[PDB]
Amino acid sequence: MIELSLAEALFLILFTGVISMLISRRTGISYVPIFILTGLVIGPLLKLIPRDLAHEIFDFVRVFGLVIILFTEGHNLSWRLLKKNMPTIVTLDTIGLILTALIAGFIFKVVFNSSFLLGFLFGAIIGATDPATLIPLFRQYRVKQDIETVIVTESIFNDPLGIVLTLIAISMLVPGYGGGIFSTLSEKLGIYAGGVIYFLYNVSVSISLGIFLGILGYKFIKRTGIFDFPEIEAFSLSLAFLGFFIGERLDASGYLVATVTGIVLGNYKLLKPRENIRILKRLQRAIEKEVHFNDTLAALATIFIFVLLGAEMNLEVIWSNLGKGLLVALGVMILARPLATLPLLKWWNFREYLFIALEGPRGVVPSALASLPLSLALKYKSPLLTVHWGEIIMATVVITVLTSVIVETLWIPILKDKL
Amino acid sequence: MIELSLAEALFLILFTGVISMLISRRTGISYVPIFILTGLVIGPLLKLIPRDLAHEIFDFVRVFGLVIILFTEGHNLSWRLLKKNMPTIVTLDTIGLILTALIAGFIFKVVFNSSFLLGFLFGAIIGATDPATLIPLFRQYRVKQDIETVIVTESIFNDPLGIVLTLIAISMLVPGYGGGIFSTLSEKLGIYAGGVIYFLYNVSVSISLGIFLGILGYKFIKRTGIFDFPEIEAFSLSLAFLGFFIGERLDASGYLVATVTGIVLGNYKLLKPRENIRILKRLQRAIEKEVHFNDTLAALATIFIFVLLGAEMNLEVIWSNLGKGLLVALGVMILARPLATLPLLKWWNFREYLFIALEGPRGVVPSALASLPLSLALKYKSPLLTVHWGEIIMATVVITVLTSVIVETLWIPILKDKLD
Ligand SMILES: CCCCCCCCO[C@@H]1O[C@H](CO)[C@@H](O)[C@H](O)[C@H]1O
Ligand SMILES: CCCCCCCCCCC
Ligand SMILES: [Tl+]
Ligand SMILES: [Tl+]
């Protein structure tokens, strides 16, 4: 605890996270458990970074980090690969996501003895997936591309869709956090109906404003000539955060807005420019630079998120509920997940569907949403969501992230040969 | 009291700053008064960004910003051009800087009926130079590459040294700031000898540590194979701040350590000859990626610094002493700089000397250290430095920056066509 409380803590997270990243690449082991372990070392163990600083930093890193993460994830998306295998993807992010959210919710409620709403909070938090761990092994194991594309795309589209479900599941238990459209719509049309209508509204408006601001920004780049350093990176950053803030100002998921914007800018090629060659080549250069910068920021954000999650956990609650946590984990990675991917069996084989379903692990987004109910319960004390359930949900999320990551990372060589 | 949301405030500053940057590039107007006027619009006038909130943000933006900016700036230094023009820039960064701070401080002391310490604080603040607002007009008029090299390098070295001089002046006013060594010497030798010996200590230790960390980092990159995304950027950032914190824990200028580190990293080919071609390729790849990211961050930090400076100022005190601040500013531009640059004509002609001694403006660093004594006054209670004197210092720094940038960027063609 000799270090500076604020600055040197941040720098400690950065430094140790970087070293952890290096040794992760060198070892070949996943970056998730390495980062979590690092946080565990500098956090709970060595007591260098107490939970207070962890929360305070995580309150900013949540917003900035998640926004930039979803933006860069939007960038690394090719719409053609999506269109080639659309139906098997679009439905699972529309239905399968909510389905596994409900099954995880129930299977959480029946073991931790709570409300279906809190269980649904856990499920919504843990909704998004992260297959970035599997990719380094996929490329060297030469697994089929047709599944990699649909899994990665699935993650790209479910990441912001897990935040909105978390945002609404929270808004139910705490009255203050929800406001504007949700309050009135829910007050006039009940919880369920008003919630579904609010969901559709949020998604539709987010996609609309996303495409709008994406194309508008893309045209603004040409109209005023933004190709050179440092205007492109700065303007793109400001664009993403513009989408987020005015997307949230009219009460809608600005995260999904930023994601869709990243999709638009990421696929400028298909925007029908009818423009000259010079402009498009130099614009390709500019977009590449911007992608580099923002992806660096997203890397730093990823590291910070995982390390903070590792340094914000308390081993007391976790060890107190380890068996239950593992039970929930295996409950959502073996039971909830395949039964939520049933419609995928329509266009896919038995073993293929089994693979795709069973495979998906949880990562960045659930890690960044884990401490949210806790941190919110501490500030806005509600009898439905207290500190106890905050610790419970968070611990369960961390447990499931770790478990899913390690287990699903380790069981692919044999499963490849079996199929 | 804080009104607008923090995240929305930060975003507002970023957005308006970017738009202002575009407008500044297209119009040809220097980005300094554009940013300052932008912040001025969103700051005092509209009260979108509360002055207290501006303070709280600035306290972070200066620490992160100055470090990343100086570290990046260190890469833009050529050791060959440094060796070819050593005594000149050495005379500039040492003698010229200190003398400038002293005489400008004397002017401020005379005008505002100040003490010697407050004046020296002002001079130390406006000691640094930022010729980045002159580069376009330099490479458009095809001015001599020599004087451009000299000016730019002088900026590179005198930017952190200006913070040290400010650190000195700050430590002499508030009891808490002066840490470790400086205190000992100060209570043993006195403020003069203590300040000088601590200056030498800070400079030497920061430079040596910067070289050590630069070489160590280079060897680590070369060894472990830190060549590709995203290892190089993250690691270089971690190193850039490692130098800062380590340097600050040794009671030295961490900014100077980061700067020297950037100097070492920028000149990677020089550290080892005979090294394989492929190695130089990969190393240049990594270095270019790093430079891209960190320079982008430095640009954002510059935007934030200038805009925040614009949003922080209060027009009351400024307009109350506009003539005084302008008088001090003209005293710095006309008297201070050339009088401190007089021994430079031992290697250059009178015209070249005059150009050099009339071009150097005040930009980023003095703009980030503008409200530092004011902030400290609001933080700690000292019988020497008060609040309103911090207001005076800040406002005078603002006027100085604006006038220096505007005028010394404006008179470039008239001055050049007469001199060279
Ligand atoms: C003005 C000097 C600051 C550096 C400007 C670099 C402009 C080009 O930026 C380039 O972006 C590329 C995107 O892939 C990176 O791979 C390169 O490393 C980077 O140099
Ligand atoms: C309060 C102590 C509770 C102990 C629970 C430990 C769970 C370990 C499960 C191992 C499968
Ligand atoms: Tl994802
Ligand atoms: Tl400079």
Numbering used by the authors:
A (entry chain B): 1 to 419
B (entry chain A): 1 to 420
Question: Mind quoting what the paper says about this structure?
Answer:
H5 and H12 in the 6-helix bundle are discontinuous. dimer indicates clusters of charged residues on both sides of the membrane. transported by PaNhaP, K+ is not. structure thus serves as an excellent model for the membrane part of NHE1.
but unlike K+, Tl+ is a substrate of PaNhaP. Tl+ is able to replace Na+ in PaNhaP. the main-chain carbonyl of Thr129 coordinate the substrate ion. Glu154 and Asn158 is not directly involved in ion coordination. ion via a bound water molecule. molecule next to Tl+ is green. surface and ∼22 Å from the extracellular surface. structure shows the inward-open conformation of PaNhaP. Tl+ may account for the lower transport rate in PaNhaP.
